[PDB]
Coordinates of C-alpha atoms in Angstrom, one line a residue:
X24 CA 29.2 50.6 -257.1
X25 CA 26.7 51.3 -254.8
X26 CA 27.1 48.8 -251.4
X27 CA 24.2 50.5 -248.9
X28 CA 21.6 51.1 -252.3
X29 CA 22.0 47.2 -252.8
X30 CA 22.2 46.1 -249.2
X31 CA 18.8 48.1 -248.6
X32 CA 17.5 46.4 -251.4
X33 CA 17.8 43.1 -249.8
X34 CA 17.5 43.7 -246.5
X35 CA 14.2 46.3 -246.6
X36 CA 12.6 43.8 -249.7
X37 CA 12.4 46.8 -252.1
X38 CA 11.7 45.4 -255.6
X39 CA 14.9 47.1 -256.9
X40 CA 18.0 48.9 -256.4
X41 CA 16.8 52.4 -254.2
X42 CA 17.9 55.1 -256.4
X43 CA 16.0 58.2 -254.8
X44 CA 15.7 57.9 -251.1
X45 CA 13.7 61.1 -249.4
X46 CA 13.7 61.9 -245.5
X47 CA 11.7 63.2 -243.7
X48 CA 11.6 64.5 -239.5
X49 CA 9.8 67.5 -237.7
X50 CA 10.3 69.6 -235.1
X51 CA 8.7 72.5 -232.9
X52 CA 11.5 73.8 -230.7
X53 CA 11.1 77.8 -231.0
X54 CA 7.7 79.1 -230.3
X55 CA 4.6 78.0 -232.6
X56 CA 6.9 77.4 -235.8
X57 CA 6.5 74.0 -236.2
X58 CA 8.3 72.7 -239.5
X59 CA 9.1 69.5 -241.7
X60 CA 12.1 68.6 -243.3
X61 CA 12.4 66.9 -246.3
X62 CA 15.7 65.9 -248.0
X63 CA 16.4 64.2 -251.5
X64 CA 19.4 61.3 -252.2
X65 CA 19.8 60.5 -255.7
X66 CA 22.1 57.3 -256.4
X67 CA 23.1 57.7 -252.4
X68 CA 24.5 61.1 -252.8
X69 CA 22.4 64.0 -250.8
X70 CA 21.0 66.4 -253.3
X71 CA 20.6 69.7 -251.6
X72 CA 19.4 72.1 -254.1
X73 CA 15.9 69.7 -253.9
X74 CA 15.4 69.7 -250.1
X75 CA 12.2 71.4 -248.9
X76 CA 11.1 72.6 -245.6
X77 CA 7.1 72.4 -244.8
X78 CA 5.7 75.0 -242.1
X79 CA 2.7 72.6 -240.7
X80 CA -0.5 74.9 -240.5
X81 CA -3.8 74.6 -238.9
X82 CA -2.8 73.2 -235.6
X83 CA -3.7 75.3 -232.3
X84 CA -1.4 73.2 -230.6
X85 CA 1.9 70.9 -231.3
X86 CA 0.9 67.1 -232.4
X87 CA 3.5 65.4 -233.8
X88 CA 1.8 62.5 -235.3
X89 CA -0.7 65.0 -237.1
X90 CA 2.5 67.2 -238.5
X91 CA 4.2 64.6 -240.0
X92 CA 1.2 63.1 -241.4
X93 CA -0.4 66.8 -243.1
X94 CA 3.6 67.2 -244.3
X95 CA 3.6 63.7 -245.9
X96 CA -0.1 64.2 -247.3
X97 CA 1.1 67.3 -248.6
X98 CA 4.0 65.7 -250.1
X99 CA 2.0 63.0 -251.3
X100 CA -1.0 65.4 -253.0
X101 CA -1.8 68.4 -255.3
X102 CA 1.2 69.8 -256.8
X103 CA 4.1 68.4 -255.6
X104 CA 2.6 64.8 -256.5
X105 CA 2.3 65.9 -259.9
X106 CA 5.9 67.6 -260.4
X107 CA 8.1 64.8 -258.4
X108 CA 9.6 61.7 -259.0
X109 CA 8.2 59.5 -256.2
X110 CA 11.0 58.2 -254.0
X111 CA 12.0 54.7 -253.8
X112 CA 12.1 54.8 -249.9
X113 CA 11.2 57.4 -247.6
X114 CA 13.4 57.4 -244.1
X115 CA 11.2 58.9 -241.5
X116 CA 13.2 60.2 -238.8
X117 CA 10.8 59.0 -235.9
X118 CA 9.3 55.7 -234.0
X119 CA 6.5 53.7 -234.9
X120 CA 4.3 56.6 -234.1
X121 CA 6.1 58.8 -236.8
X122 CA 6.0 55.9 -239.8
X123 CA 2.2 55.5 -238.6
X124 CA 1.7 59.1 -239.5
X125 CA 3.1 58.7 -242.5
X126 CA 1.6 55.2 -243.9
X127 CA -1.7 56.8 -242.6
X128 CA -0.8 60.0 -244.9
X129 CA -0.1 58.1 -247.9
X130 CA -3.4 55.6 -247.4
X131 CA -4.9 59.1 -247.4
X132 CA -3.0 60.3 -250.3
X133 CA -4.2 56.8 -252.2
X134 CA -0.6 56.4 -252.6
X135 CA 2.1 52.9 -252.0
X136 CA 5.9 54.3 -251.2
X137 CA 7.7 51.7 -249.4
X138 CA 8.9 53.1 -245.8
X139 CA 11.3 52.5 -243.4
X140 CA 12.1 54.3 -239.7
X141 CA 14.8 55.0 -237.5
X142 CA 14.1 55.4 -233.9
X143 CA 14.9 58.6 -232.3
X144 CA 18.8 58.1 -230.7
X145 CA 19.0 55.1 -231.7
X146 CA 20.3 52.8 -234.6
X147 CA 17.4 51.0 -234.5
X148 CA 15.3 50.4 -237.7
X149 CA 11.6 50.2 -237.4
X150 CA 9.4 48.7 -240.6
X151 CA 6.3 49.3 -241.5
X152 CA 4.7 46.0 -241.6
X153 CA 6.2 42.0 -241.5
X154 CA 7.1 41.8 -244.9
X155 CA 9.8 44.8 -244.6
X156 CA 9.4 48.3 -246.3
X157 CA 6.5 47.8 -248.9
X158 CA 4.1 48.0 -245.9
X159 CA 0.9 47.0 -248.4
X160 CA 2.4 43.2 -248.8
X161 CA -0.4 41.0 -247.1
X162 CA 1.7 38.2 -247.3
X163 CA 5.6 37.2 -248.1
X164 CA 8.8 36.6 -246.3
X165 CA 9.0 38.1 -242.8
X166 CA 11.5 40.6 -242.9
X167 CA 13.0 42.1 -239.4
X168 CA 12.1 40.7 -235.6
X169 CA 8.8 42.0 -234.7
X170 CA 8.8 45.0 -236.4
X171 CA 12.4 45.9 -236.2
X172 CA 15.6 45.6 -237.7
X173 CA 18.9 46.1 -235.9
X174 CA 22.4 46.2 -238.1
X175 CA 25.7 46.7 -236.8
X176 CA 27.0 50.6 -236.6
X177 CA 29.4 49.9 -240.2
X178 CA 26.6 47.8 -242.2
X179 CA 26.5 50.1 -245.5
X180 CA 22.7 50.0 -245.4
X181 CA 22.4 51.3 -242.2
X182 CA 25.4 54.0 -242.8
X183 CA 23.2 55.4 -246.0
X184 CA 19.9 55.8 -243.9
X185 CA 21.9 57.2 -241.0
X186 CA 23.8 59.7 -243.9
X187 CA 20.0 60.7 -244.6
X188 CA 19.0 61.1 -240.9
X189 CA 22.2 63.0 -240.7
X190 CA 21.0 65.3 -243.8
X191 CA 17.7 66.3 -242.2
X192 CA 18.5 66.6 -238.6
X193 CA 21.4 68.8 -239.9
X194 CA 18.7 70.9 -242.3
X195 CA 16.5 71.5 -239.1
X196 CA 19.5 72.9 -237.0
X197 CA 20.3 74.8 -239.6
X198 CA 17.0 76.7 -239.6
X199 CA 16.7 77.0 -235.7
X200 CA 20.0 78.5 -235.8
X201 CA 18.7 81.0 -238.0
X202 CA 15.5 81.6 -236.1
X203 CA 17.7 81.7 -233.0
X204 CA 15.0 86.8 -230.4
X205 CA 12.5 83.7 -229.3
X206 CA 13.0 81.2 -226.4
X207 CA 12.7 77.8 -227.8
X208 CA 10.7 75.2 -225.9
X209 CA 12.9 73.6 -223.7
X210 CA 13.7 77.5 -222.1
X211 CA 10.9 76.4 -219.0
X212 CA 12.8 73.3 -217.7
X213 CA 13.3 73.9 -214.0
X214 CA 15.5 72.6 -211.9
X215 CA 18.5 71.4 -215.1
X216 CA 20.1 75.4 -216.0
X217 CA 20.4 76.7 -219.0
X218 CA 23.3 74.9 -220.5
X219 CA 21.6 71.4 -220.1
X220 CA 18.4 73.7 -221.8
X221 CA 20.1 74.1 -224.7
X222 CA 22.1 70.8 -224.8
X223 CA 18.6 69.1 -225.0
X224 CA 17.8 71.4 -228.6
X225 CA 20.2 69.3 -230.5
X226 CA 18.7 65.8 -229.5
X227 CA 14.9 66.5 -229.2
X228 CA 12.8 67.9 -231.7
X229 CA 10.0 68.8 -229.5
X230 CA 8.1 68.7 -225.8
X231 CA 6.6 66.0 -226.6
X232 CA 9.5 64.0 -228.2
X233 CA 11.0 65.3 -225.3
X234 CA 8.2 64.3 -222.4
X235 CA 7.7 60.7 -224.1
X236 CA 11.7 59.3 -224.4
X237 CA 13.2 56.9 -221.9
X238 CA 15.1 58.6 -219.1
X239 CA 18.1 56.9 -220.2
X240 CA 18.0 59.2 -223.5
X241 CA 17.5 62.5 -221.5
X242 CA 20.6 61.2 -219.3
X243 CA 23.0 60.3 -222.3
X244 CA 22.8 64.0 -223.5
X245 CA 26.6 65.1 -223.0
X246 CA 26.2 67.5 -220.0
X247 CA 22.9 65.6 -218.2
X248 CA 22.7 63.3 -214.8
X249 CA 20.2 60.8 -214.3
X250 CA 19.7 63.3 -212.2
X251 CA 18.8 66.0 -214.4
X252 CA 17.2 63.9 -216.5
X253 CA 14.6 62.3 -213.8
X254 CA 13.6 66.3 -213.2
X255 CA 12.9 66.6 -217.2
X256 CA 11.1 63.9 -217.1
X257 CA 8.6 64.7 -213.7
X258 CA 8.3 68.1 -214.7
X259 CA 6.5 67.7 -218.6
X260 CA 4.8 64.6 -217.1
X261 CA 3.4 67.1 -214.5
X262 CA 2.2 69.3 -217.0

Protein backbone atom coordinates (compact mmCIF):
# COMPACT_ATOMS: atom_id res chain seq x y z
CA UNK A 1 0.00 0.00 0.00
CA UNK A 2 1.40 2.95 -1.19
CA UNK A 3 -0.86 6.28 -0.08
CA UNK A 4 1.49 9.36 -1.46
CA UNK A 5 2.49 7.10 -4.99
CA UNK A 6 -1.38 7.04 -5.50
CA UNK A 7 -2.30 10.41 -4.22
CA UNK A 8 0.47 11.95 -6.63
CA UNK A 9 -1.08 10.00 -9.27
CA UNK A 10 -4.27 11.87 -8.94
CA UNK A 11 -3.38 14.95 -7.86
CA UNK A 12 -0.11 15.63 -10.45
CA UNK A 13 -2.40 13.67 -13.46
CA UNK A 14 0.40 11.15 -14.03
CA UNK A 15 -1.00 8.37 -16.28
CA UNK A 16 -0.19 5.75 -13.54
CA UNK A 17 0.90 4.93 -10.19
CA UNK A 18 4.79 6.91 -9.79
CA UNK A 19 6.98 4.02 -9.10
CA UNK A 20 10.49 5.76 -9.68
CA UNK A 21 10.51 9.29 -8.56
CA UNK A 22 14.19 11.23 -9.17
CA UNK A 23 15.15 14.70 -7.52
CA UNK A 24 16.98 16.91 -8.43
CA UNK A 25 18.59 20.60 -6.62
CA UNK A 26 21.98 22.53 -7.08
CA UNK A 27 24.03 24.40 -5.23
CA UNK A 28 27.41 26.65 -5.33
CA UNK A 29 28.13 27.50 -1.74
CA UNK A 30 32.11 26.80 -1.41
CA UNK A 31 34.16 28.51 -4.02
CA UNK A 32 33.70 27.58 -7.92
CA UNK A 33 32.33 23.92 -7.07
CA UNK A 34 29.16 24.13 -8.28
CA UNK A 35 27.24 20.65 -8.08
CA UNK A 36 23.83 18.76 -8.87
CA UNK A 37 22.18 16.29 -6.86
CA UNK A 38 20.33 13.74 -8.06
CA UNK A 39 18.47 11.14 -5.93
CA UNK A 40 16.49 7.80 -6.89
CA UNK A 41 12.96 6.52 -4.98
CA UNK A 42 11.82 3.27 -6.10
CA UNK A 43 8.19 2.25 -4.90
CA UNK A 44 8.54 5.52 -2.39
CA UNK A 45 11.53 4.25 -0.65
CA UNK A 46 14.95 6.36 -1.28
CA UNK A 47 17.51 4.20 -3.03
CA UNK A 48 20.87 5.53 -2.05
CA UNK A 49 23.31 3.25 -3.69
CA UNK A 50 21.78 5.06 -7.18
CA UNK A 51 22.10 8.69 -6.24
CA UNK A 52 24.57 10.74 -8.37
CA UNK A 53 26.23 13.99 -7.93
CA UNK A 54 26.98 16.23 -11.22
CA UNK A 55 29.91 18.90 -11.04
CA UNK A 56 28.38 21.55 -13.67
CA UNK A 57 31.37 22.57 -16.04
CA UNK A 58 31.84 25.21 -18.55
CA UNK A 59 30.49 28.11 -16.62
CA UNK A 60 32.96 31.22 -15.74
CA UNK A 61 30.48 32.23 -13.47
CA UNK A 62 27.46 30.74 -11.13
CA UNK A 63 23.88 30.65 -13.16
CA UNK A 64 21.63 28.66 -11.69
CA UNK A 65 19.10 28.26 -14.33
CA UNK A 66 21.94 27.19 -16.85
CA UNK A 67 23.28 24.44 -14.07
CA UNK A 68 20.30 22.76 -13.54
CA UNK A 69 19.47 22.77 -17.10
CA UNK A 70 23.24 21.25 -18.46
CA UNK A 71 22.67 18.67 -15.24
CA UNK A 72 19.23 17.67 -16.53
CA UNK A 73 20.43 17.57 -20.26
CA UNK A 74 23.09 15.51 -19.10
CA UNK A 75 20.81 13.31 -17.35
CA UNK A 76 18.55 13.28 -20.09
CA UNK A 77 21.45 12.50 -23.00
CA UNK A 78 24.40 10.25 -24.01
CA UNK A 79 25.01 7.53 -21.62
CA UNK A 80 23.04 7.86 -18.79
CA UNK A 81 19.86 8.10 -21.19
CA UNK A 82 20.84 4.83 -22.50
CA UNK A 83 21.64 2.91 -19.17
CA UNK A 84 18.49 4.31 -16.91
CA UNK A 85 15.11 3.73 -16.39
CA UNK A 86 13.52 7.09 -16.99
CA UNK A 87 11.69 8.29 -13.93
CA UNK A 88 8.08 8.59 -13.56
CA UNK A 89 8.39 12.18 -11.97
CA UNK A 90 11.29 14.22 -11.44
CA UNK A 91 10.92 16.70 -8.11
CA UNK A 92 13.09 19.74 -8.87
CA UNK A 93 14.06 21.32 -5.75
CA UNK A 94 13.57 24.99 -7.04
CA UNK A 95 10.88 27.70 -8.37
CA UNK A 96 9.44 28.15 -11.62
CA UNK A 97 12.88 29.30 -12.72
CA UNK A 98 14.41 25.80 -11.70
CA UNK A 99 11.49 23.54 -13.47
CA UNK A 100 11.99 26.02 -16.55
CA UNK A 101 15.55 24.87 -16.71
CA UNK A 102 14.68 21.68 -16.64
CA UNK A 103 11.53 21.39 -19.14
CA UNK A 104 13.87 23.50 -21.32
CA UNK A 105 16.69 20.64 -20.79
CA UNK A 106 14.49 17.90 -21.60
CA UNK A 107 12.83 19.91 -24.93
CA UNK A 108 16.54 19.95 -25.59
CA UNK A 109 17.15 16.45 -24.80
CA UNK A 110 13.85 15.58 -27.20
CA UNK A 111 12.69 13.97 -24.21
CA UNK A 112 8.67 14.02 -22.20
CA UNK A 113 9.24 13.21 -18.19
CA UNK A 114 6.43 14.63 -16.29
CA UNK A 115 7.69 17.35 -13.60
CA UNK A 116 6.68 18.78 -10.69
CA UNK A 117 8.50 21.70 -8.18
CA UNK A 118 8.76 22.69 -4.79
CA UNK A 119 9.49 26.14 -4.05
CA UNK A 120 12.53 26.88 -2.02
CA UNK A 121 11.20 27.06 1.99
CA UNK A 122 8.19 26.51 1.26
CA UNK A 123 5.51 23.64 0.87
CA UNK A 124 4.44 25.03 -2.01
CA UNK A 125 4.16 22.91 -5.32
CA UNK A 126 4.79 24.48 -8.53
CA UNK A 127 3.64 22.59 -11.98
CA UNK A 128 4.90 22.73 -15.14
CA UNK A 129 1.98 23.70 -17.20
CA UNK A 130 -2.18 23.83 -16.48
CA UNK A 131 -2.82 20.34 -17.04
CA UNK A 132 -0.52 19.28 -13.88
CA UNK A 133 2.92 17.40 -14.27
CA UNK A 134 2.89 16.10 -18.00
CA UNK A 135 3.84 19.61 -18.97
CA UNK A 136 3.38 18.65 -23.01
CA UNK A 137 -0.62 18.24 -22.52
CA UNK A 138 -2.06 21.15 -24.81
CA UNK A 139 -5.19 20.61 -23.54
CA UNK A 140 -7.09 18.57 -20.53
CA UNK A 141 -8.36 19.24 -17.02
CA UNK A 142 -6.75 22.10 -15.22
CA UNK A 143 -4.86 20.81 -12.52
CA UNK A 144 -3.55 23.37 -9.60
CA UNK A 145 -4.44 27.31 -9.18
CA UNK A 146 -2.43 29.21 -11.60
CA UNK A 147 0.40 27.22 -11.73
CA UNK A 148 0.52 25.95 -8.18
CA UNK A 149 -0.62 23.46 -5.90
CA UNK A 150 -0.78 23.88 -2.10
CA UNK A 151 -1.58 20.55 0.23
CA UNK A 152 -1.76 20.58 3.77
CA UNK A 153 1.70 19.74 5.73
CA UNK A 154 0.31 15.62 6.51
CA UNK A 155 -1.25 15.14 2.78
CA UNK A 156 0.82 11.81 1.87
CA UNK A 157 1.56 13.27 -1.55
CA UNK A 158 3.14 16.12 -0.36
CA UNK A 159 5.03 14.14 2.64
CA UNK A 160 6.64 11.70 -0.29
CA UNK A 161 7.93 14.85 -2.45
CA UNK A 162 8.99 16.59 0.76
CA UNK A 163 10.82 12.87 1.85
CA UNK A 164 12.60 13.43 -1.66
CA UNK A 165 13.49 17.13 -1.12
CA UNK A 166 14.68 15.97 2.20
CA UNK A 167 16.95 13.18 0.43
CA UNK A 168 18.72 15.70 -1.83
CA UNK A 169 19.10 18.68 0.37
CA UNK A 170 20.49 16.14 2.83
CA UNK A 171 23.05 14.59 -0.04
CA UNK A 172 24.24 18.24 -0.74
CA UNK A 173 25.10 18.95 2.99
CA UNK A 174 26.63 15.97 3.17
CA UNK A 175 29.22 16.85 0.46
CA UNK A 176 29.83 20.58 1.77
CA UNK A 177 30.52 19.10 4.97
CA UNK A 178 33.12 17.18 3.41
CA UNK A 179 34.52 19.99 1.32
CA UNK A 180 34.24 22.07 4.54
CA UNK A 181 39.99 24.74 4.06
CA UNK A 182 37.63 27.02 1.60
CA UNK A 183 35.30 29.86 2.64
CA UNK A 184 31.94 29.22 1.24
CA UNK A 185 29.98 31.95 -0.31
CA UNK A 186 28.00 33.52 2.17
CA UNK A 187 31.69 34.09 4.25
CA UNK A 188 31.50 38.12 2.63
CA UNK A 189 28.12 39.12 4.26
CA UNK A 190 28.78 42.27 6.23
CA UNK A 191 27.16 43.61 8.75
CA UNK A 192 25.19 39.72 10.11
CA UNK A 193 28.62 37.80 11.91
CA UNK A 194 29.64 34.71 11.28
CA UNK A 195 27.17 32.53 13.02
CA UNK A 196 24.19 34.05 11.07
CA UNK A 197 27.01 33.26 7.87
CA UNK A 198 26.85 29.97 8.45
CA UNK A 199 23.20 29.60 9.62
CA UNK A 200 22.34 30.88 6.07
CA UNK A 201 24.52 27.48 4.35
CA UNK A 202 21.83 25.17 5.37
CA UNK A 203 18.80 27.12 3.82
CA UNK A 204 20.39 28.71 0.61
CA UNK A 205 22.01 26.90 -2.03
CA UNK A 206 23.65 29.84 -3.54
CA UNK A 207 24.26 33.93 -3.89
CA UNK A 208 21.87 34.10 -6.07
CA UNK A 209 19.25 31.85 -4.41
CA UNK A 210 20.29 33.86 -1.69
CA UNK A 211 20.16 37.66 -3.37
CA UNK A 212 16.60 36.74 -5.07
CA UNK A 213 14.35 35.21 -1.82
CA UNK A 214 11.80 37.38 0.04
CA UNK A 215 13.28 39.00 3.09
CA UNK A 216 10.84 37.18 5.11
CA UNK A 217 12.90 33.84 4.22
CA UNK A 218 16.30 35.42 5.05
CA UNK A 219 14.48 36.56 8.49
CA UNK A 220 12.95 33.04 9.40
CA UNK A 221 16.51 31.49 9.49
CA UNK A 222 16.76 30.41 13.31
CA UNK A 223 19.30 33.07 14.47
CA UNK A 224 18.34 36.12 11.84
CA UNK A 225 16.38 39.61 12.48
CA UNK A 226 14.53 41.31 9.94
CA UNK A 227 17.18 43.12 10.74
CA UNK A 228 19.90 41.02 9.64
CA UNK A 229 18.09 39.97 6.95
CA UNK A 230 17.28 43.63 5.32
CA UNK A 231 21.36 43.96 5.41
CA UNK A 232 21.63 40.44 3.28
CA UNK A 233 19.39 41.60 1.21
CA UNK A 234 20.90 45.47 0.39
CA UNK A 235 24.29 44.15 0.39
CA UNK A 236 24.04 41.29 -2.75
CA UNK A 237 21.53 43.72 -4.40
CA UNK A 238 24.44 46.29 -4.14
CA UNK A 239 26.68 44.09 -5.82
Amino acid sequence: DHPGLDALKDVLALPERPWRIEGYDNSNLFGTNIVSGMVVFEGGRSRRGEHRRFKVRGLEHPDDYESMKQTIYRRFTGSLADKLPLPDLMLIDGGRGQVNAALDALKEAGVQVPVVGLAKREERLILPGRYGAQWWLETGTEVGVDRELLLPHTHPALRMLIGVRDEVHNYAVSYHRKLRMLRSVFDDLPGIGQKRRDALLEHFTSLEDLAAAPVEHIAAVPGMTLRAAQSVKEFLQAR
